[PDB]
Write an enzyme that holds these catalytic residues in place. Structure first.
Site, PDB file in Angstrom:
ATOM      1  N   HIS B 352       0.767  -1.254   0.000  1.00  0.00           N
ATOM      2  CA  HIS B 352       0.000   0.000   0.000  1.00  0.00           C
ATOM      3  C   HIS B 352       0.789   1.290   0.000  1.00  0.00           C
ATOM      4  CE1 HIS B 352      -3.789  -2.119   1.133  1.00  0.00           C
ATOM      5  NE2 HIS B 352      -2.936  -2.927   1.744  1.00  0.00           N
ATOM      6  N   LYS B 543      -8.555  13.914   4.564  1.00  0.00           N
ATOM      7  CA  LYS B 543      -7.695  12.730   4.579  1.00  0.00           C
ATOM      8  C   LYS B 543      -6.715  12.967   5.727  1.00  0.00           C
ATOM      9  CE  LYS B 543      -6.721  13.991   0.360  1.00  0.00           C
ATOM     10  NZ  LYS B 543      -6.628  12.835  -0.587  1.00  0.00           N
ATOM     11  N   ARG B 544      -5.958  11.956   6.137  1.00  0.00           N
ATOM     12  CA  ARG B 544      -5.008  12.157   7.240  1.00  0.00           C
ATOM     13  C   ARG B 544      -3.985  13.248   6.870  1.00  0.00           C
ATOM     14  NH1 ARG B 544      -4.620   8.084  11.387  1.00  0.00           N
ATOM     15  NH2 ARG B 544      -2.813   9.378  11.952  1.00  0.00           N
ATOM     16  N   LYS B 549       0.716  14.313   1.265  1.00  0.00           N
ATOM     17  CA  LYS B 549      -0.610  14.616   0.747  1.00  0.00           C
ATOM     18  C   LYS B 549      -0.757  16.110   0.403  1.00  0.00           C
ATOM     19  CE  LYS B 549      -2.908  10.809   3.261  1.00  0.00           C
ATOM     20  NZ  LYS B 549      -3.565   9.971   2.200  1.00  0.00           N
ATOM     21  N   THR B 651      -8.618   6.542  -1.975  1.00  0.00           N
ATOM     22  CA  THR B 651      -9.972   6.005  -2.130  1.00  0.00           C
ATOM     23  C   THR B 651     -10.960   7.123  -1.873  1.00  0.00           C
ATOM     24  OG1 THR B 651      -9.843   5.159   0.162  1.00  0.00           O
ATOM     25  CG2 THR B 651      -9.615   3.548  -1.614  1.00  0.00           C
ATOM     26  N   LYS B 655     -14.666   8.309  -3.734  1.00  0.00           N
ATOM     27  CA  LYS B 655     -15.900   8.671  -3.036  1.00  0.00           C
ATOM     28  C   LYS B 655     -16.466   9.989  -3.567  1.00  0.00           C
ATOM     29  CE  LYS B 655     -14.010   6.457   1.051  1.00  0.00           C
ATOM     30  NZ  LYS B 655     -13.447   6.782   2.354  1.00  0.00           N
TER      31      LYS B 655
END
Ligand code: PLP
Ligand code: PLP
Ligand code: GLC
Ligand code: GLC
Lengths: 813, 813
Positions: B352, B543-544, B549, B651, B655
Site C-alpha cells: 500500500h 484525509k489524514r 498529501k 480512495t 468517493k
C-alpha cells in the site's frame, strides 16, 4: 397522536403465561438469536444459557413492574451497603421463586434436554469471603420476599474469592474468572455512570470548604434482579465497576490504574489489612452509592431519614457517614447540626466480630492524602462527640482517650467502629451473646453514653436456597405433612414436633438423609475421584480456615480416633467420614499449615489397612456456596467448635440444623440460641463457656498443664513433632506444635478432653438410628427462628422503620 | 425420540416476514426484556438500541443460514488478515442491505419515534487509521455481496483511532471509548478462545525443534456479521481480544499486562514505529487466526491451498508466513519443501505504499527474544530464497545483498516486505501506476526473479455505503432513470451519459448537490456552531494530515486567494468555502503544525470584513467515516494533490467522484485511472508527473529557485515568517517555512504555479452552473470502475481462485 403512540410501548404481554409451549418457543428464540448458535454446534453450556435467558425474561417483566410500583408508592427506601455479596448460583433459585421449575423441566425434556445437567453448568458468583458476604445475600432474598423497597449496593469485582486447588496437600490459589462466559443476569447501566474523587486538597473559600484538584474515577453500575418468593417482587442489587475518566499509547494503557479499584476482592475473612487499594474500594462504593441515593431521593433534607435508611455491613462502608456530611454541608450547604441529625437518623451499623485484628483502624496519613476533606470532617465529628462525652462524664479523661475516634501512638489511626457508633442511630450485634459481649467489653463506654443505640439482630439464612433448593427431598417429605406455608413462615416447622413418634416420618427423614449421602458420595467420586463410605457418619466442618474456629481441635480428635483404633484394632467403632473444608487467606501462614495437616493426617489414616473403612479423613477442596448446597444436606454431624466468645454468630451452623444434622459445639455465637430453641438435650454442647475462658485469661493459660495431664494428647503432640505425619520432612509441623504448646490464643488443649468425651456421646447415639433420627426431627422442627425472614423483619421494624409485607404484586400481564 | 426431539430447535421461523406489525412487536420486546427499560425512562439512545436489536435479529437469522450453507457446500475459504478494519456505523447499512429500511421507518413512526434521530445516536466503530482500514471494510462488504466464503480477521481494540478535539487551534487527542455503551452487533465467543505464545526458547530434540518456556496470552474471538446487498448472505469479521491465562493481589492486577495487547490501535498512518507492543499485536492476530484456519480446515495438507487463501493486508500480518511454516513443520511434522509449497500457494501480499519510512523492518534483536523460533524459520527461508537468486543470477552478489530478507547495518533488521514476496504466490499494488512503480523501483529485483507474482488490483469503494447510504438524494434521481441494478453492478452508471444533455437530469443533479450542501451547513451549525455559506463552491480536502498529501500546498492557494482579494477588493471572485480535515499522528510534529496553520489562516481570513462571505477557511474537526458520509455528498471540488508517485491509490478520491464532485489533482495513484475513465477533459489534472519529479531529484530540488521567481509565493512566505498569521507569536511557523524552503521532500513550491492556475480554471467553470453540472454528470457516469465489487471480483479470479456469484440464498423461514 405523537407521544400517545408510545403507549403501545408496554410490558403488557410477555414471553408467556408461564407454561410449556411458550417456554419452548422462547428457548428456541434465545438459542439462535441471542447466542447465535444452532442445534448442530450447541453444547450443554449453550443450552444452559438459552434456558437462563428464557427464565430471565420472566424475571425482567416482574423487575420492571416492581420498580414502577415503587415509584408510584414512594415507600421509604432501604440501602444495604456491603463490600461483599456472596450470591452463588442463580438459575434454580430464580425458577423456584417464580414457580417456573416444573414447566421448565417439561419444556427442556420435550426439546430433548435434561435440565439438571444444564443447571450444573452454572458456577457461583463469589463476590464474598464467607459468612458476612453470604449473610448479605440471604438478606437480599429476604427483603424481596418481605416486600421491602431494598437495594443492595456493592462493587462488581472482576475476580471474586479465588478458586482453591489442593496441590501436594497444600492450598494453591487460582483467579476466579467468573465472568469469562459472561453473566446473563446482570444489566450494564453505562448511562448511569457517576464520578468518584480521590486525593486533591481542601481550600476554604468565603462560602465554605472546597475539595479541589482531585483525580476522578468513574463508577459504572451493573444491576442484578433479586426475586422474592412467589410474590412477584423483584428488587435490585447494584454493583459499581471502576472506569477511567475520558505519550499517547502509555496514557491509554495507564487507564488500567483506575480500573484496578474493582479488579479483585480482598480474600481476608475476619482480618484487617490496611492496604490503600482496599481504602479506595470502600470510598468508591460509598461515594457512588450516596450520589445515587440522593439523586433517587430528589426525583428539603428534613425528610431524608423518613425516605432513606443506610445500613452499614461492618465498618467497610463506614465512610458513608463523613461522605454524607460532606455532601450535605459542602454541596447542599446545610448547617452542621442539621446535617448531623440527618446523618445519624439515616445510618445504622452492624458489627460482626469481637477480635481486635479484624477491626478497621486506618492510618491518618493514608486518609489525609487520599481523602483530605473526609479526615477534616472526621476530626470535627470527633471533637463534637468527645464534647458530649465530657459533658456526660465530667473529668473522666481516660474515657475521652478510650472513646476517641482517633487512636494515638506512633501511627495515628482512625477507629472506624467508633466513627460508626457516633454517626449511627442504631448499632447491632449478630447473635444474643455477641450483642451482649459488645455492650460490656469493646463498646461498653459507648453503651454507657447512649444505651438506646445498642440492639441485637440474630443472624438467619434463607429457607429458599438453604432448604427448598439444596434439599428437595427434605422439603418434599416436610410438605407432605404440613403444606408449603413454612417456606415463607419457617416457624411452622414447629408442627413437625407432632411427628417425633410417627414411624413413617422417622423412616422418611432417615431415607432422605441417606439419599443425600449417597448422592454426595457420587458427586465426590465423579469430580474428584474420591471414595467415601455412605454408611458411615458424615462428620463435617466447613468454614474458612482460622485458629479461632479451631479446625486444629477437630484434627486432634481425628488423630485420637485413629490412635484408639490402632490401640484396640478389633474393637468396634461407629464408622465415620470426617470432612473438613474451607479456604485460608493467601497470606495466613498458620491457616495454610493447618490445611496441610488435614491432608497429611488423611494420607496416613486413609491408607492404613487396619483402619479400612472405619475412619476416613477428607479435605473438601474449594468450599464455596455451591459445595455447601451439596455437602450440608448430606451431613450427620455439624462441627461448630470455635472458642467461646470468638464466633459472633455463625450461619453455617443454622444451615446444618435446618438440613438434618445434629450439632456438636461450644456455647458460642448463635449456637447458644440454637441449643435454646431445640433444647440442650437435643444438642451436643461441650467445653469452656465465655466465663471459663475469661477466668483462664485472668490466671494465665498454660498449655503445658494439659499436656502434662493428658497422656492421649501427649501421644498426639509427639507424633506431630516426630514426623509421624510427615516422614519425609519430620519438622514440617513444628510451627503448629509450638503455637499449640506456647502461643495458643484460642486454648485448643483446654477443650480437648470434653470435646473427645462429647464425641463419644455422639457416636453412642448414632449407634441407635431410631433415636438419632428422632433427635434430628427435634432440631429441624425448632430451626424456625433462624430464617433470615425473621432477622430482616426485626431490622425493618426496630431499625429501618418499615413494615414487612407478604402482599403479592400482580403478574406482569 | 431423544435426539430427534432437538429437531424442533431450528431457526425455522424468526422475528417476522419483514414487515411493520412484527417489527413493532419485537422492538417493544427488546426495549423491555433486552434493555430492561420502559417508555417512562427510555431515552433516544435506549430507543436506538431497541431498534438495533430488532434489526440484528433479521441479520442473525441470515448469519446462521449462511454459515450452515458454507459447511454443506465446503467452498474454498478466503481469510483477509488486517490489523485494521474501519467499519463506521452499522444500523443503516444493515437496514439497506436487508431491505428493511422502509418498514423500520414506518414501525418507528407508528410507535411515536423518528428513525433518523435514532440512527444519528450510533457512532463509528473506528478500528482503523484511514485508507487501508476503510479499504478492508469496503472489501468485507463486497465479498459478502459477491457470495464469497470470506472471513475478516483482526484485533478487537478497546480504543480505536482517537477522537480529535481542536483546542486553541491545535489538535488534542481523546481516547475513543467506542464500547462504553456496548456494541450490539458483535457476539463474544469465549468458548473458542485460543492460546498465543511469546518469548521462550527453542530446543532441538531428536524429532525436531520445540518452542518451550513461553508465556501465554489467550485470544478470545468476537464475531460481527457483515451483510451482502440483498442476497441474504451474511459473512463474518472475527476480531481477537487479549486475555491473561488462568503476592496474590498484585498477581491478579498484573493480568493487565497481557490484556494490553488489544488495548489500543497504533495511530500511525503510512509510518512505521517499531514498538514491541505493535509486534505483539501482529503476532497475536496471526497466531490465533492461523490456528482457527487450520482447525476449521480439519473439521493431508496437499489440498490446503485448494481450501484456503490468506490475504495479507500490507506487511502487518506478514508473520503468517513463518507461523504457517512453524505449524506445518514443527507441529504437523511435514517436510520443509512440502510445507513451503503449501505456504506460498496459500498466501498473497498487498502493498500500500512506496515511502521508505512506512515499510516494516523489525530489529532482529526484538524478534530473537520475542519470537525465537520465527527468526530461525525466517533465516532458513532467506537462505533458501537467496540460493534461488544466486542460481538465477550467478555472481550477482549485490543483488543477493539487495534481495535479502536480512538488512545489515549496526542494527540488523528483517525486511518484512521481502519476507512477503518470498512467501506469497501473488504480490499486488493497489493502482495501475503504483503496481508499475513497484515493478521498476522498490521490488524490481523480485519482479526480475519472479515476474508471474506481480499483479495490480486497483482499489475501489462500496457503492452501498458510499452512494446509496450517504447520498439518498443522488441514489434516487439515478434510480428514477436507470433502475436499481447499478447498486450491485456500478458500470451501469455509464447509462447516465445518455442524459448529459437532458434538462431535467441536469436540474436534478444540481438540486441534489445543493440540498446536500444546505443540510451539511445545517449539520455544522448545529454541532459546531460554525456557519458556512451554502451558495459558495465547497472545496474539500479530507484525509489524514501528511507532508506527502500536501495540505500545505492547499494552504498556499488559500492564502493566494486571500491576498488577491485584498489586492483588488472590488473584483468579483467565485465564492468558496475551503474545508480541510483529517487527523495527525500524535507524534508527527509537522502534521500538527500544519493543522495549526490551517486554523490560523482561518482566524485571519474568516474575520476580515473586506473578504466577508467571498472566502471562508474551515478545519473540519474529527474527520472520520461518519463525517465523510456527510461532507463528501456536499462537496463540489475534490482535492487530491499528493506529489506524483507518493499516493499508492487513494480512495477518498473515488468517493468524491461517485458523489458529484469534480476533481483537481496530480497524476498520482488512482487519479490517473479516474481521469482515464472520465476523460481528462472532464478532470482538473495539473502539476509534475512522476517523470518530472524524478528529473528534479536527479538534478537536485532547490526551492529557493521558485521563491526567487514567483512574487506571489514570496509574499506568502514573508507573511508566514512575519507572524502575519500568528501576531502574538511571530515565529510560530518557523518550522514550516524552513522545511518548505530547505527540506521539502515533497516539492510544494514546484507545483504551486500550475496549481493556482488550475484552480483558476475550476472557478471559471463553476461560474457556469450548467456546464459545471454537465461535467459532473460525466464523472458520476464513469465512476463504475471504482466499485470495490470490481476490485474484489479480480482478487477472487486472479489471486484466490474462486468465482464471484450473485446467487441469493433463501430468506431464513
Ligand atoms: C454459610 C457459609 C459460610 C458461613 O459459615 P460459618 O461456619 O458461619 O463461618 C461460609 N462459606 C460459605 C460458602 C457459606 O455458604
Ligand atoms: C475513504 C477514507 C479515507 C481514505 O482517504 P484518502 O484521501 O484516500 O487517503 C480516510 N479516512 C476516512 C474516514 C475515509 O472514509
Ligand atoms: O454476621 C455474619 C457473619 O460475619 C462474620 O463472618 C462472622 O465471623 C460470623 O460469625 C457471622 O455469622
Ligand atoms: O490501499 C488502501 C490505501 O492504503 C494506504 O492508506 C495508502 O496511503 C492509500 O493510497 C491506499 O489507497
Amino acid at each position: 397522536s405523537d407521544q400517545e403512540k408510545r403507549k403501545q410501548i408496554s410490558v403488557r404481554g410477555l414471553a408467556g403465561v408461564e407454561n410449556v409451549t411458550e417456554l419452548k418457543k422462547n428457548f428456541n428464540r434465545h438459542l439462535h438469536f441471542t447466542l447465535v448458535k444452532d442445534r448442530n454446534v450447541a453444547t450443554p453450556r449453550d443450552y444452559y444459557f438459552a434456558l437462563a435467558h428464557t427464565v430471565r425474561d420472566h424475571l425482567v417483566g416482574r423487575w420492571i413492574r416492581t420498580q414502577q410500583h415503587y415509584y408510584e408508592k414512594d415507600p421509604k427506601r432501604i440501602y444495604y451497603l456491603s463490600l461483599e455479596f456472596y450470591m452463588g448460583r442463580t438459575l434454580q433459585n430464580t425458577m423456584v421463586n417464580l414457580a417456573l421449575e416444573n414447566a421448565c423441566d417439561e419444556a427442556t425434556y420435550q426439546l430433548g434436554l435434561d435440565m439438571e445437567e444444564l443447571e450444573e453448568i452454572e458456577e457461583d458468583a463469589g463476590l464474598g469471603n464467607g459468612g458476612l458476604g453470604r449473610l448479605a445475600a440471604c438478606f437480599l432474598d429476604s427483603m424481596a420476599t418481605l416486600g421491602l423497597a431494598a437495594y443492595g449496593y456493592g462493587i462488581r469485582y472482576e475476580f471474586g474469592i479465588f478458586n482453591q486447588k489442593i496441590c501436594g496437600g497444600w492450598q494453591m490459589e487460582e483467579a476466579d474468572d467468573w465472568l469469562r462466559y459472561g453473566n446473563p443476569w446482570e444489566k450494564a447501566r453505562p448511562e448511569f455512570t457517576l464520578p468518584v474523587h480521590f486525593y486533591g486538597r481542601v481550600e476554604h473559600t468565603s462560602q465554605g470548604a472546597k475539595w479541589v484538584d482531585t483525580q476522578v474515577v468513574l463508577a459504572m453500575p451493573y444491576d442484578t434482579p433479586v426475586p422474592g418468593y412467589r410474590n412477584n417482587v423483584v428488587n435490585t442489587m447494584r454493583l459499581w465497576s471502576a472506569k477511567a475518566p475520558n505519550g499517547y499509547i502509555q496514557a491509554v494503557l495507564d487507564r488500567n490504574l483506575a480500573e484496578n479499584i474493582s479488579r479483585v476482592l480482598y480474600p481476608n475473612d475476619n482480618f484487617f489489612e490496611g492496604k490503600e487499594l482496599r481504602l479506595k474500594q470502600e470510598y468508591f462504593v460509598v461515594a457512588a452509592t450516596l450520589q445515587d441515593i440522593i439523586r433517587r431521593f430528589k426525583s428539603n433534607f428534613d425528610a431524608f431519614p423518613d425516605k432513606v435508611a443506610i445500613q452499614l455491613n461492618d465498618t467497610h462502608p463506614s465512610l458513608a457517614i463523613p461522605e454524607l456530611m460532606r455532601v450535605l454541608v459542602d454541596l447542599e450547604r446545610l448547617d452542621w447540626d442539621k446535617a448531623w441529625e440527618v446523618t445519624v437518623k439515616t445510618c445504622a451499623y452492624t458489627n460482626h466480630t469481637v477480635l481486635p485484628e479484624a477491626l478497621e483502624r486506618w492510618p491518618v496519613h493514608l486518609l489525609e492524602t487520599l481523602l483530605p476533606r473526609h479526615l477534616q470532617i472526621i476530626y470535627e465529628i470527633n471533637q463534637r462527640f468527645l464534647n458530649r462525652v465530657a459533658a456526660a462524664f465530667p473529668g473522666d479523661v481516660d474515657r475521652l482517650r478510650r472513646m476517641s475516634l482517633v487512636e494515638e501512638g506512633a501511627v495515628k489511626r482512625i477507629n472506624m467502629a467508633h466513627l460508626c457508633i457516633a454517626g449511627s442511630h442504631a448499632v447491632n450485634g449478630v447473635a444474643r451473646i455477641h450483642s451482649e459481649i459488645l455492650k460490656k467489653t469493646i463498646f461498653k463506654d459507648f453503651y454507657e453514653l447512649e444505651p438506646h443505640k445498642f440492639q441485637n439482630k440474630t443472624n438467619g439464612i434463607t429457607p429458599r436456597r438453604w432448604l427448598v433448593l439444596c434439599n428437595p427431598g427434605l422439603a418434599e417429605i416436610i410438605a407432605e405433612r404440613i403444606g408449603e406455608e413454612y417456606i415463607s413462615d419457617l416457624d411452622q416447622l414447629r408442627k413437625l414436633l407432632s411427628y417425633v413418634d410417627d414411624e413413617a416420618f422417622i423412616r422418611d427423614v432417615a431415607k432422605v438423609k441417606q439419599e443425600n449421602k449417597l448422592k454426595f458420595a457420587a458427586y465426590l467420586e465423579r469430580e474428584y475421584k474420591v471414595h467415601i463410605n455412605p454408611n458411615s457418619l458424615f462428620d463435617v466442618q466447613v468454614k474458612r480456615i482460622h485458629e479461632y474456629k479451631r479446625q486444629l481441635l477437630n484434627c486432634l480428635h481425628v488423630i485420637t480416633l485413629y490412635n484408639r483404633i490402632k490401640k484396640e484394632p478389633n474393637k468396634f467403632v461407629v464408622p465415620r467420614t470426617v470432612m473438613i473444608g474451607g479456604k485460608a487467606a493467601p497470606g495466613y501462614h498458620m491457616a495454610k499449615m493447618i490445611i496441610k495437616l488435614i491432608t497429611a493426617i488423611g494420607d496416613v489414616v486413609n491408607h492404613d489397612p487396619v483402619v479400612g473403612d472405619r475412619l476416613r479423613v477428607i479435605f473438601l477442596e474449594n468450599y464455596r456456596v455451591s459445595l455447601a448446597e451439596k455437602v450440608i444436606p448430606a451431613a450427620d454431624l455439624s462441627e461448630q467448635i470455635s472458642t467461646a466468645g470468638t464466633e459472633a454468630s455463625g450461619t453455617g451452623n443454622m444451615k446444618f440444623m435446618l438440613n438434618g444434622a445434629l450439632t456438636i459445639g461450644t456455647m458460642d455465637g448463635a449456637n447458644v440460641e440454637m441449643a435454646e430453641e431445640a433444647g440442650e438435650e437435643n444438642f451436643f454442647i461441650f467445653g469452656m463457656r465465655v466465663e471459663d475462658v475469661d477466668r483462664l485469661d485472668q490466671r494465665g493459660y498454660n498449655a503445658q498443664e494439659y499436656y502434662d495431664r493428658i497422656p492421649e494428647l501427649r501421644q498426639i503432640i509427639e507424633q506431630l513433632s516426630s514426623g509421624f505425619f510427615s516422614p519425609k520432612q519430620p519438622d514440617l509441623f513444628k510451627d503448629i506444635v509450638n503455637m499449640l504448646m506456647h502461643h495458643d490464643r484460642f486454648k485448643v488443649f483446654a477443650d480437648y478432653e470434653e470435646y473427645v468425651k462429647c464425641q463419644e456421646r455422639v457416636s453412642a447415639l448414632y449407634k441407635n438410628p431410631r433415636e438419632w433420627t428422632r433427635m434430628v426431627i427435634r432440631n429441624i422442627a425448632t430451626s424456625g427462628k433462624f430464617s433470615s425472614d425473621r432477622t430482616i423483619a426485626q431490622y425493618a421494624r426496630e431499625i429501618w422503620g418499615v413494615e414487612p409485607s407478604r402482599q403479592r404484586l400482580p403478574a406482569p400481564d
